Design a protein around this motif. Structure first.
Motif, PDB file in Angstrom:
ATOM      1  N   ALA A  55       0.860  -1.205   0.000  1.00 38.07           N
ATOM      2  CA  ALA A  55       0.000   0.000   0.000  1.00 38.07           C
ATOM      3  C   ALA A  55       0.887   1.243   0.000  1.00 38.07           C
ATOM      4  N   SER A  56       1.673   1.424   1.062  1.00 37.42           N
ATOM      5  CA  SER A  56       2.598   2.582   1.134  1.00 37.42           C
ATOM      6  C   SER A  56       3.322   2.744  -0.209  1.00 37.42           C
ATOM      7  N   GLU A  57       3.798   1.640  -0.787  1.00 32.68           N
ATOM      8  CA  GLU A  57       4.503   1.694  -2.092  1.00 32.68           C
ATOM      9  C   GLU A  57       3.661   2.496  -3.091  1.00 32.68           C
ATOM     10  N   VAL A  58       2.413   2.082  -3.325  1.00 37.00           N
ATOM     11  CA  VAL A  58       1.554   2.768  -4.337  1.00 37.00           C
ATOM     12  C   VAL A  58       1.512   4.268  -4.013  1.00 37.00           C
ATOM     13  N   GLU A  59       1.189   4.625  -2.769  1.00 35.59           N
ATOM     14  CA  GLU A  59       1.106   6.053  -2.364  1.00 35.59           C
ATOM     15  C   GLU A  59       2.351   6.809  -2.846  1.00 35.59           C
ATOM     16  N   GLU A  60       3.536   6.358  -2.441  1.00 37.19           N
ATOM     17  CA  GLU A  60       4.795   7.032  -2.841  1.00 37.19           C
ATOM     18  C   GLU A  60       4.867   7.101  -4.372  1.00 37.19           C
ATOM     19  N   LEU A  61       4.805   5.950  -5.045  1.00 36.28           N
ATOM     20  CA  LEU A  61       4.876   5.913  -6.528  1.00 36.28           C
ATOM     21  C   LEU A  61       3.918   6.957  -7.120  1.00 36.28           C
ATOM     22  N   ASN A  62       2.672   6.986  -6.646  1.00 32.90           N
ATOM     23  CA  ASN A  62       1.665   7.949  -7.169  1.00 32.90           C
ATOM     24  C   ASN A  62       2.102   9.388  -6.876  1.00 32.90           C
ATOM     25  N   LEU A  63       2.356   9.725  -5.611  1.00 29.16           N
ATOM     26  CA  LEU A  63       2.707  11.124  -5.251  1.00 29.16           C
ATOM     27  C   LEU A  63       4.011  11.525  -5.957  1.00 29.16           C
ATOM     28  N   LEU A  66       4.880  10.430  -9.037  1.00 32.44           N
ATOM     29  CA  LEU A  66       4.464  10.716 -10.433  1.00 32.44           C
ATOM     30  C   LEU A  66       3.757  12.076 -10.450  1.00 32.44           C
ATOM     31  N   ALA A  67       3.092  12.436  -9.353  1.00 32.02           N
ATOM     32  CA  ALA A  67       2.428  13.755  -9.269  1.00 32.02           C
ATOM     33  C   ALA A  67       3.496  14.848  -9.262  1.00 32.02           C
ATOM     34  N   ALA A  68       4.543  14.666  -8.457  1.00 25.62           N
ATOM     35  CA  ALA A  68       5.648  15.651  -8.425  1.00 25.62           C
ATOM     36  C   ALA A  68       6.305  15.682  -9.798  1.00 25.62           C
ATOM     37  N   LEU A  69       6.433  14.510 -10.421  1.00 25.01           N
ATOM     38  CA  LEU A  69       7.010  14.453 -11.784  1.00 25.01           C
ATOM     39  C   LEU A  69       5.988  15.048 -12.755  1.00 25.01           C
ATOM     40  N   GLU A 120       3.879  17.551 -12.244  1.00 26.73           N
ATOM     41  CA  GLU A 120       3.865  19.005 -12.135  1.00 26.73           C
ATOM     42  C   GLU A 120       5.160  19.602 -12.674  1.00 26.73           C
ATOM     43  N   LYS A 121       6.272  18.872 -12.556  1.00 30.72           N
ATOM     44  CA  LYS A 121       7.532  19.384 -13.082  1.00 30.72           C
ATOM     45  C   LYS A 121       7.520  19.380 -14.604  1.00 30.72           C
ATOM     46  N   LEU A 122       6.801  18.428 -15.203  1.00 35.54           N
ATOM     47  CA  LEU A 122       6.577  18.462 -16.643  1.00 35.54           C
ATOM     48  C   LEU A 122       5.764  19.685 -17.039  1.00 35.54           C
ATOM     49  N   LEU A 123       4.822  20.091 -16.184  1.00 33.85           N
ATOM     50  CA  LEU A 123       4.066  21.315 -16.426  1.00 33.85           C
ATOM     51  C   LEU A 123       4.963  22.544 -16.325  1.00 33.85           C
ATOM     52  N   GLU A 124       5.866  22.559 -15.341  1.00 34.67           N
ATOM     53  CA  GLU A 124       6.807  23.667 -15.215  1.00 34.67           C
ATOM     54  C   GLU A 124       7.826  23.668 -16.349  1.00 34.67           C
ATOM     55  N   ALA A 125       8.238  22.483 -16.810  1.00 35.56           N
ATOM     56  CA  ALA A 125       9.187  22.405 -17.914  1.00 35.56           C
ATOM     57  C   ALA A 125       8.578  22.931 -19.208  1.00 35.56           C
TER      58      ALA A 125
END
Lengths: 50, 38, 53, 198, 54, 49
Positions: free
Chosen positions: A30-38, A40-43, A45-50
Protein backbone atom coordinates in the motif's frame (compact mmCIF):
# COMPACT_ATOMS: atom_id res chain seq x y z
CA UNK A 1 6.33 -0.29 -10.52
CA UNK A 2 2.78 1.07 -10.15
CA UNK A 3 1.49 -1.73 -12.39
CA UNK A 4 3.19 -4.40 -10.30
CA UNK A 5 1.90 -3.21 -6.93
CA UNK A 6 -1.72 -3.22 -8.08
CA UNK A 7 -1.34 -6.74 -9.48
CA UNK A 8 0.39 -7.82 -6.27
CA UNK A 9 -2.43 -6.35 -4.17
CA UNK A 10 -5.18 -7.80 -6.39
CA UNK A 11 -3.92 -11.39 -6.28
CA UNK A 12 -3.47 -11.18 -2.50
CA UNK A 13 -7.15 -10.17 -2.27
CA UNK A 14 -7.96 -13.58 -3.79
CA UNK A 15 -6.16 -15.32 -0.94
CA UNK A 16 -8.46 -17.73 0.96
CA UNK A 17 -11.02 -16.33 3.35
CA UNK A 18 -9.14 -17.12 6.55
CA UNK A 19 -5.70 -17.07 4.91
CA UNK A 20 -6.43 -13.49 3.80
CA UNK A 21 -4.14 -11.69 6.27
CA UNK A 22 -2.73 -8.17 6.94
CA UNK A 23 0.93 -9.22 6.43
CA UNK A 24 3.68 -6.55 6.33
CA UNK A 25 3.82 -7.21 2.57
CA UNK A 26 0.30 -5.67 2.27
CA UNK A 27 1.45 -2.72 4.45
CA UNK A 28 4.41 -1.93 2.15
CA UNK A 29 2.43 -2.80 -1.04
CA UNK A 30 0.00 0.00 0.00
CA UNK A 31 2.60 2.58 1.13
CA UNK A 32 4.50 1.69 -2.09
CA UNK A 33 1.55 2.77 -4.34
CA UNK A 34 1.11 6.05 -2.36
CA UNK A 35 4.80 7.03 -2.84
CA UNK A 36 4.88 5.91 -6.53
CA UNK A 37 1.66 7.95 -7.17
CA UNK A 38 2.71 11.12 -5.25
CA UNK A 39 6.14 10.85 -6.98
CA UNK A 40 4.46 10.72 -10.43
CA UNK A 41 2.43 13.76 -9.27
CA UNK A 42 5.65 15.65 -8.42
CA UNK A 43 7.01 14.45 -11.78
CA UNK A 44 3.78 15.44 -13.48
CA UNK A 45 3.86 19.01 -12.13
CA UNK A 46 7.53 19.38 -13.08
CA UNK A 47 6.58 18.46 -16.64
CA UNK A 48 4.07 21.32 -16.43
CA UNK A 49 6.81 23.67 -15.22
CA UNK A 50 9.19 22.40 -17.91
CA UNK B 1 5.43 -4.72 12.72
CA UNK B 2 2.99 -1.91 13.55
CA UNK B 3 -0.78 -2.32 13.39
CA UNK B 4 -1.61 1.37 12.96
CA UNK B 5 -5.00 3.00 12.35
CA UNK B 6 -6.25 4.65 9.17
CA UNK B 7 -9.13 7.13 9.34
CA UNK B 8 -11.39 4.94 7.13
CA UNK B 9 -11.39 1.64 9.03
CA UNK B 10 -12.88 -1.39 7.24
CA UNK B 11 -13.10 -4.42 9.58
CA UNK B 12 -15.79 -6.26 7.52
CA UNK B 13 -13.83 -9.48 6.59
CA UNK B 14 -12.70 -10.55 10.12
CA UNK B 15 -16.43 -10.83 11.00
CA UNK B 16 -17.34 -13.23 8.16
CA UNK B 17 -14.05 -15.14 8.80
CA UNK B 18 -14.70 -15.91 12.51
CA UNK B 19 -18.29 -16.69 11.40
CA UNK B 20 -17.05 -19.77 9.45
CA UNK B 21 -14.34 -20.56 12.09
CA UNK B 22 -15.05 -19.34 15.71
CA UNK B 23 -11.51 -20.21 16.88
CA UNK B 24 -9.90 -16.84 15.96
CA UNK B 25 -7.85 -14.20 17.88
CA UNK B 26 -8.84 -10.42 17.94
CA UNK B 27 -8.24 -8.45 14.70
CA UNK B 28 -7.62 -5.17 16.59
CA UNK B 29 -4.96 -2.40 16.31
CA UNK B 30 -1.67 -2.14 18.25
CA UNK B 31 -7.24 3.89 -1.06
CA UNK B 32 -10.09 5.66 0.73
CA UNK B 33 -12.65 4.60 -1.90
CA UNK B 34 -13.98 1.59 -3.83
CA UNK B 35 -13.86 0.55 -7.47
CA UNK B 36 -17.29 0.89 -9.19
CA UNK B 37 -17.15 -2.79 -10.17
CA UNK B 38 -16.63 -3.69 -6.51
CA UNK C 1 -19.08 -74.94 14.15
CA UNK C 2 -18.05 -74.63 10.48
CA UNK C 3 -21.44 -73.11 9.46
CA UNK C 4 -21.08 -70.62 12.39
CA UNK C 5 -17.62 -69.61 11.06
CA UNK C 6 -19.02 -69.14 7.51
CA UNK C 7 -21.57 -66.71 9.02
CA UNK C 8 -18.80 -64.69 10.75
CA UNK C 9 -16.68 -64.73 7.54
CA UNK C 10 -19.70 -63.81 5.33
CA UNK C 11 -20.86 -61.00 7.69
CA UNK C 12 -17.45 -59.28 7.53
CA UNK C 13 -18.16 -58.90 3.78
CA UNK C 14 -21.75 -57.63 4.30
CA UNK C 15 -20.46 -55.05 6.82
CA UNK C 16 -17.59 -54.13 4.46
CA UNK C 17 -19.87 -53.70 1.44
CA UNK C 18 -22.44 -51.74 3.51
CA UNK C 19 -19.67 -49.27 4.55
CA UNK C 20 -18.13 -49.11 1.04
CA UNK C 21 -21.60 -48.09 -0.18
CA UNK C 22 -21.70 -45.08 2.22
CA UNK C 23 -18.21 -43.93 1.07
CA UNK C 24 -19.50 -44.16 -2.56
CA UNK C 25 -23.05 -42.73 -2.44
CA UNK C 26 -21.77 -39.82 -0.34
CA UNK C 27 -19.10 -39.29 -3.04
CA UNK C 28 -21.69 -39.12 -5.85
CA UNK C 29 -23.17 -36.23 -3.79
CA UNK C 30 -20.13 -33.96 -3.08
CA UNK C 31 -21.09 -31.34 -5.74
CA UNK C 32 -18.94 -28.13 -5.96
CA UNK C 33 -21.04 -26.27 -3.31
CA UNK C 34 -20.16 -29.26 -1.06
CA UNK C 35 -18.86 -27.28 2.03
CA UNK C 36 -16.10 -29.89 2.63
CA UNK C 37 -14.30 -29.60 -0.77
CA UNK C 38 -10.47 -29.28 -0.49
CA UNK C 39 -7.13 -29.96 -2.29
CA UNK C 40 -6.07 -33.11 -0.34
CA UNK C 41 -2.43 -34.11 0.51
CA UNK C 42 -1.02 -36.77 -1.89
CA UNK C 43 -4.55 -37.33 -3.42
CA UNK C 44 -3.57 -39.71 -6.25
CA UNK C 45 -1.69 -42.23 -4.06
CA UNK C 46 -2.59 -45.96 -3.97
CA UNK C 47 -2.66 -46.86 -0.19
CA UNK C 48 -1.50 -50.23 1.23
CA UNK C 49 -4.39 -52.77 1.14
CA UNK C 50 -5.03 -51.64 -2.48
CA UNK C 51 -6.35 -54.88 -4.04
CA UNK C 52 -7.65 -55.18 -7.63
CA UNK C 53 -10.86 -55.97 -9.57
CA UNK D 1 12.13 -9.10 0.13
CA UNK D 2 9.10 -8.84 2.49
CA UNK D 3 6.75 -11.01 0.33
CA UNK D 4 9.69 -13.48 0.26
CA UNK D 5 9.85 -13.63 4.07
CA UNK D 6 6.08 -14.42 4.02
CA UNK D 7 6.67 -17.34 1.58
CA UNK D 8 9.62 -18.74 3.62
CA UNK D 9 7.37 -18.45 6.72
CA UNK D 10 4.29 -19.65 4.88
CA UNK D 11 6.35 -22.59 3.59
CA UNK D 12 7.62 -23.23 7.12
CA UNK D 13 4.02 -23.51 8.22
CA UNK D 14 2.92 -25.43 5.14
CA UNK D 15 5.67 -28.08 5.19
CA UNK D 16 5.02 -28.58 8.90
CA UNK D 17 1.29 -28.79 8.29
CA UNK D 18 2.04 -31.52 5.73
CA UNK D 19 3.86 -33.68 8.33
CA UNK D 20 0.95 -33.53 10.85
CA UNK D 21 -1.74 -34.83 8.52
CA UNK D 22 0.38 -37.56 6.87
CA UNK D 23 1.31 -38.73 10.36
CA UNK D 24 -2.37 -38.76 11.34
CA UNK D 25 -2.93 -41.06 8.35
CA UNK D 26 -0.33 -43.48 9.73
CA UNK D 27 -1.66 -43.56 13.29
CA UNK D 28 -5.24 -43.99 12.08
CA UNK D 29 -3.91 -46.90 9.98
CA UNK D 30 -2.42 -48.53 13.09
CA UNK D 31 -5.73 -47.99 14.88
CA UNK D 32 -7.45 -49.24 11.71
CA UNK D 33 -5.96 -52.71 12.21
CA UNK D 34 -6.17 -52.65 16.01
CA UNK D 35 -9.94 -52.24 15.75
CA UNK D 36 -9.84 -55.27 13.46
CA UNK D 37 -7.78 -57.23 15.99
CA UNK D 38 -10.45 -56.15 18.48
CA UNK D 39 -13.22 -57.67 16.42
CA UNK D 40 -11.54 -60.93 15.43
CA UNK D 41 -11.28 -61.76 19.12
CA UNK D 42 -15.07 -61.34 19.18
CA UNK D 43 -14.99 -63.53 16.06
CA UNK D 44 -13.21 -66.37 17.88
CA UNK D 45 -14.97 -66.19 21.27
CA UNK D 46 -18.35 -67.43 20.00
CA UNK D 47 -16.93 -70.91 19.42
CA UNK D 48 -16.02 -71.41 23.09
CA UNK D 49 -19.51 -70.20 24.07
CA UNK D 50 -21.11 -72.85 21.87
CA UNK D 51 -18.75 -75.43 23.39
CA UNK D 52 -19.80 -74.55 26.95
CA UNK D 53 -23.49 -74.45 26.04
CA UNK D 54 -23.22 -77.86 24.38
CA UNK D 55 -21.34 -79.27 27.38
CA UNK D 56 -24.01 -78.01 29.77
CA UNK D 57 -26.80 -79.32 27.53
CA UNK D 58 -25.35 -82.82 27.38
CA UNK D 59 -24.36 -83.03 31.05
CA UNK D 60 -27.96 -82.48 32.15
CA UNK D 61 -28.46 -85.67 30.15
CA UNK D 62 -27.31 -87.97 32.97
CA UNK D 63 -28.86 -90.90 34.77
CA UNK D 64 -30.36 -90.84 38.25
CA UNK D 65 -27.44 -91.57 40.67
CA UNK D 66 -24.78 -89.68 38.66
CA UNK D 67 -26.73 -86.44 38.03
CA UNK D 68 -24.60 -84.50 40.51
CA UNK D 69 -23.43 -80.99 41.60
CA UNK D 70 -19.71 -81.11 41.34
CA UNK D 71 -16.65 -79.11 40.44
CA UNK D 72 -17.27 -79.42 36.69
CA UNK D 73 -20.69 -77.77 36.98
CA UNK D 74 -19.09 -74.90 38.91
CA UNK D 75 -16.34 -74.24 36.37
CA UNK D 76 -18.68 -74.73 33.40
CA UNK D 77 -21.03 -72.04 34.74
CA UNK D 78 -18.07 -69.77 35.52
CA UNK D 79 -16.72 -70.21 31.99
CA UNK D 80 -20.13 -69.32 30.53
CA UNK D 81 -20.27 -66.16 32.64
CA UNK D 82 -16.67 -65.28 31.76
CA UNK D 83 -17.27 -65.65 28.01
CA UNK D 84 -20.32 -63.37 28.17
CA UNK D 85 -18.39 -60.79 30.19
CA UNK D 86 -15.56 -60.91 27.64
CA UNK D 87 -17.90 -60.30 24.69
CA UNK D 88 -19.58 -57.29 26.28
CA UNK D 89 -16.15 -55.88 27.16
CA UNK D 90 -15.08 -56.44 23.55
CA UNK D 91 -18.22 -54.82 22.13
CA UNK D 92 -17.65 -51.68 24.22
CA UNK D 93 -14.03 -51.32 23.11
CA UNK D 94 -15.07 -51.51 19.45
CA UNK D 95 -17.49 -48.61 19.94
CA UNK D 96 -14.62 -46.65 21.53
CA UNK D 97 -12.36 -47.52 18.60
CA UNK D 98 -14.73 -46.21 15.92
CA UNK D 99 -15.17 -42.94 17.83
CA UNK D 100 -11.39 -42.51 17.99
CA UNK D 101 -11.17 -43.13 14.24
CA UNK D 102 -13.91 -40.58 13.51
CA UNK D 103 -12.22 -37.94 15.66
CA UNK D 104 -8.94 -38.78 13.93
CA UNK D 105 -10.50 -38.11 10.53
CA UNK D 106 -12.40 -34.99 11.65
CA UNK D 107 -9.25 -33.51 13.27
CA UNK D 108 -7.43 -34.59 10.06
CA UNK D 109 -9.85 -33.05 7.51
CA UNK D 110 -9.66 -29.73 9.45
CA UNK D 111 -5.84 -29.65 9.30
CA UNK D 112 -5.99 -30.51 5.55
CA UNK D 113 -8.46 -27.61 4.90
CA UNK D 114 -5.93 -25.10 6.35
CA UNK D 115 -3.29 -26.69 4.05
CA UNK D 116 -5.62 -26.27 1.02
CA UNK D 117 -6.05 -22.54 1.85
CA UNK D 118 -2.26 -22.28 2.43
CA UNK D 119 -1.50 -24.01 -0.92
CA UNK D 120 -3.75 -21.53 -2.79
CA UNK D 121 -2.07 -18.56 -1.02
CA UNK D 122 1.45 -20.00 -1.54
CA UNK D 123 0.90 -20.22 -5.29
CA UNK D 124 -0.57 -16.65 -5.30
CA UNK D 125 2.22 -15.05 -3.16
CA UNK D 126 4.82 -17.08 -5.15
CA UNK D 127 3.63 -15.52 -8.42
CA UNK D 128 3.46 -12.05 -6.83
CA UNK D 129 7.23 -12.35 -6.06
CA UNK D 130 8.13 -12.96 -9.77
CA UNK D 131 6.66 -9.59 -10.94
CA UNK D 132 9.45 -7.61 -12.66
CA UNK D 133 9.16 -4.03 -14.02
CA UNK D 134 10.45 -5.44 -17.36
CA UNK D 135 7.68 -8.10 -17.17
CA UNK D 136 4.23 -7.80 -18.80
CA UNK D 137 1.25 -9.52 -17.07
CA UNK D 138 0.91 -6.68 -14.47
CA UNK D 139 -1.95 -4.22 -15.25
CA UNK D 140 -3.46 -1.02 -13.75
CA UNK D 141 -6.12 -2.72 -11.58
CA UNK D 142 -8.10 0.44 -10.51
CA UNK D 143 -7.42 1.25 -6.83
CA UNK D 144 -9.98 -0.36 -4.46
CA UNK D 145 -10.33 -0.44 -0.64
CA UNK D 146 -10.77 -4.25 -0.95
CA UNK D 147 -6.99 -4.46 -1.73
CA UNK D 148 -6.33 -3.61 1.96
CA UNK D 149 -9.39 -5.42 3.45
CA UNK D 150 -7.79 -8.23 5.54
CA UNK D 151 -9.31 -10.99 7.73
CA UNK D 152 -6.41 -11.89 10.07
CA UNK D 153 -3.29 -10.25 11.58
CA UNK D 154 0.00 -12.19 10.91
CA UNK D 155 -0.02 -13.26 14.58
CA UNK D 156 -3.66 -14.47 14.56
CA UNK D 157 -2.90 -16.23 11.24
CA UNK D 158 -0.28 -18.51 12.85
CA UNK D 159 -2.48 -19.00 15.97
CA UNK D 160 -5.19 -20.52 13.71
CA UNK D 161 -2.76 -23.17 12.41
CA UNK D 162 -0.95 -23.51 15.77
CA UNK D 163 -4.32 -24.41 17.38
CA UNK D 164 -5.21 -26.85 14.57
CA UNK D 165 -1.83 -28.60 15.08
CA UNK D 166 -2.30 -28.75 18.90
CA UNK D 167 -5.70 -30.51 18.81
CA UNK D 168 -4.55 -32.68 15.86
CA UNK D 169 -1.67 -34.15 17.93
CA UNK D 170 -4.14 -34.48 20.85
CA UNK D 171 -5.99 -37.00 18.63
CA UNK D 172 -2.56 -38.53 17.85
CA UNK D 173 -1.43 -39.12 21.48
CA UNK D 174 -5.01 -40.27 22.27
CA UNK D 175 -5.09 -43.05 19.63
CA UNK D 176 -1.60 -44.15 20.79
CA UNK D 177 -3.01 -44.35 24.33
CA UNK D 178 -6.02 -46.31 23.07
CA UNK D 179 -3.86 -48.70 21.03
CA UNK D 180 -1.98 -49.48 24.24
CA UNK D 181 -5.38 -50.03 25.90
CA UNK D 182 -6.46 -52.30 23.04
CA UNK D 183 -3.22 -54.29 23.26
CA UNK D 184 -3.60 -54.77 27.03
CA UNK D 185 -7.29 -55.72 26.87
CA UNK D 186 -6.59 -58.48 24.34
CA UNK D 187 -3.76 -60.08 26.32
CA UNK D 188 -5.89 -60.16 29.48
CA UNK D 189 -9.16 -61.55 28.12
CA UNK D 190 -7.35 -64.19 26.06
CA UNK D 191 -5.37 -65.40 29.08
CA UNK D 192 -8.33 -65.43 31.47
CA UNK D 193 -10.28 -67.55 28.98
CA UNK D 194 -7.38 -69.99 28.64
CA UNK D 195 -6.90 -70.28 32.41
CA UNK D 196 -10.61 -70.95 32.84
CA UNK D 197 -10.60 -73.58 30.09
CA UNK D 198 -7.60 -75.33 31.67
CA UNK E 1 -12.58 -47.82 2.23
CA UNK E 2 -11.84 -50.86 4.56
CA UNK E 3 -9.70 -54.03 4.15
CA UNK E 4 -10.07 -55.44 0.60
CA UNK E 5 -12.91 -53.05 -0.38
CA UNK E 6 -10.04 -50.52 -0.94
CA UNK E 7 -9.86 -51.72 -4.58
CA UNK E 8 -8.29 -49.84 -7.53
CA UNK E 9 -11.71 -49.35 -9.17
CA UNK E 10 -12.84 -47.92 -12.53
CA UNK E 11 -13.31 -44.73 -10.43
CA UNK E 12 -9.74 -44.60 -9.08
CA UNK E 13 -8.12 -45.06 -12.54
CA UNK E 14 -10.70 -42.52 -13.77
CA UNK E 15 -10.60 -39.85 -11.03
CA UNK E 16 -6.76 -40.06 -10.96
CA UNK E 17 -6.89 -39.30 -14.71
CA UNK E 18 -9.33 -36.36 -14.29
CA UNK E 19 -6.84 -34.81 -11.78
CA UNK E 20 -3.98 -34.88 -14.33
CA UNK E 21 -6.36 -33.55 -17.02
CA UNK E 22 -7.69 -30.70 -14.82
CA UNK E 23 -4.12 -29.72 -13.86
CA UNK E 24 -3.14 -29.60 -17.57
CA UNK E 25 -6.25 -27.54 -18.42
CA UNK E 26 -5.49 -25.19 -15.49
CA UNK E 27 -1.96 -24.81 -16.98
CA UNK E 28 -3.37 -24.04 -20.45
CA UNK E 29 -5.61 -21.19 -19.20
CA UNK E 30 -2.73 -19.79 -17.06
CA UNK E 31 -0.39 -19.68 -20.12
CA UNK E 32 -3.28 -18.32 -22.29
CA UNK E 33 -3.87 -15.50 -19.75
CA UNK E 34 -0.12 -14.66 -20.00
CA UNK E 35 -0.42 -14.53 -23.84
CA UNK E 36 -3.35 -12.05 -23.45
CA UNK E 37 -2.14 -9.69 -20.70
CA UNK E 38 0.96 -9.54 -22.97
CA UNK E 39 -1.22 -8.28 -25.86
CA UNK E 40 -2.94 -5.69 -23.59
CA UNK E 41 0.54 -4.30 -22.72
CA UNK E 42 1.35 -3.94 -26.45
CA UNK E 43 -2.08 -2.33 -27.10
CA UNK E 44 -1.28 0.21 -24.34
CA UNK E 45 2.28 1.00 -25.53
CA UNK E 46 0.97 1.58 -29.10
CA UNK E 47 -1.86 3.80 -27.76
CA UNK E 48 0.71 5.93 -25.90
CA UNK E 49 2.67 6.23 -29.18
CA UNK E 50 -0.41 7.10 -31.29
CA UNK E 51 -1.58 9.65 -28.66
CA UNK E 52 1.83 11.37 -28.21
CA UNK E 53 1.96 11.73 -32.03
CA UNK E 54 -1.63 13.09 -32.21
CA UNK F 1 -27.24 -15.88 26.29
CA UNK F 2 -29.57 -15.32 23.33
CA UNK F 3 -29.83 -11.56 23.99
CA UNK F 4 -26.16 -11.20 25.00
CA UNK F 5 -24.89 -12.67 21.73
CA UNK F 6 -27.13 -10.58 19.46
CA UNK F 7 -26.34 -7.41 21.43
CA UNK F 8 -22.65 -7.68 20.55
CA UNK F 9 -23.21 -8.78 16.95
CA UNK F 10 -25.15 -5.60 16.19
CA UNK F 11 -22.45 -3.43 17.82
CA UNK F 12 -19.74 -4.89 15.56
CA UNK F 13 -20.98 -2.59 12.76
CA UNK F 14 -20.11 0.75 14.36
CA UNK F 15 -18.39 2.92 11.72
CA UNK F 16 -14.66 3.71 12.07
CA UNK F 17 -13.67 5.18 15.45
CA UNK F 18 -17.07 4.37 16.99
CA UNK F 19 -16.11 0.70 17.38
CA UNK F 20 -14.79 1.07 20.93
CA UNK F 21 -13.35 -1.01 23.78
CA UNK F 22 -15.83 0.54 26.19
CA UNK F 23 -16.63 -1.46 29.33
CA UNK F 24 -19.93 -2.55 27.77
CA UNK F 25 -17.89 -4.71 25.38
CA UNK F 26 -15.96 -6.56 28.10
CA UNK F 27 -19.03 -6.99 30.34
CA UNK F 28 -21.13 -8.65 27.61
CA UNK F 29 -18.27 -11.05 26.88
CA UNK F 30 -18.31 -11.69 30.64
CA UNK F 31 -22.11 -12.06 30.40
CA UNK F 32 -21.79 -14.61 27.58
CA UNK F 33 -19.21 -16.69 29.45
CA UNK F 34 -21.20 -16.64 32.70
CA UNK F 35 -24.37 -18.05 31.14
CA UNK F 36 -22.21 -20.77 29.56
CA UNK F 37 -20.88 -21.44 33.07
CA UNK F 38 -24.43 -21.38 34.48
CA UNK F 39 -25.80 -23.68 31.77
CA UNK F 40 -22.89 -26.05 32.42
CA UNK F 41 -23.44 -26.15 36.19
CA UNK F 42 -27.19 -26.65 35.72
CA UNK F 43 -26.78 -29.53 33.27
CA UNK F 44 -24.46 -31.05 35.89
CA UNK F 45 -27.28 -31.11 38.44
CA UNK F 46 -29.69 -32.66 35.92
CA UNK F 47 -27.25 -35.53 35.34
CA UNK F 48 -26.96 -35.88 39.12
CA UNK F 49 -30.75 -35.73 39.45
Amino acid sequence: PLKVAQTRLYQRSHRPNVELCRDAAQFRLASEVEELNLSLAALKEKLLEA
Amino acid sequence: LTHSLSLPWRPSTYYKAASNWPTLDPYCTRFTRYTPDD
Amino acid sequence: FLLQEARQRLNSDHRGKMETLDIDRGCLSLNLTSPNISLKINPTRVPNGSTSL
Amino acid sequence: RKVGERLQDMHGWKSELQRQVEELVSETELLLAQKQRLERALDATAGPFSIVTDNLQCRERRQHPDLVRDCVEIELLKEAELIRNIQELLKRTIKQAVSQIRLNWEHKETCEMDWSDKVEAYNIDEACCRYNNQSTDVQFYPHSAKFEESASTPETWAKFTQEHLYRAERERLASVNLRNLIDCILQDTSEDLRLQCD
Amino acid sequence: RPNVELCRDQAQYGLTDEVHQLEATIAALKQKLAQAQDALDALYKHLARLQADI
Amino acid sequence: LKVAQTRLDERTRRPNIELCRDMAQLRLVNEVYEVDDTIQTLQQRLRDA
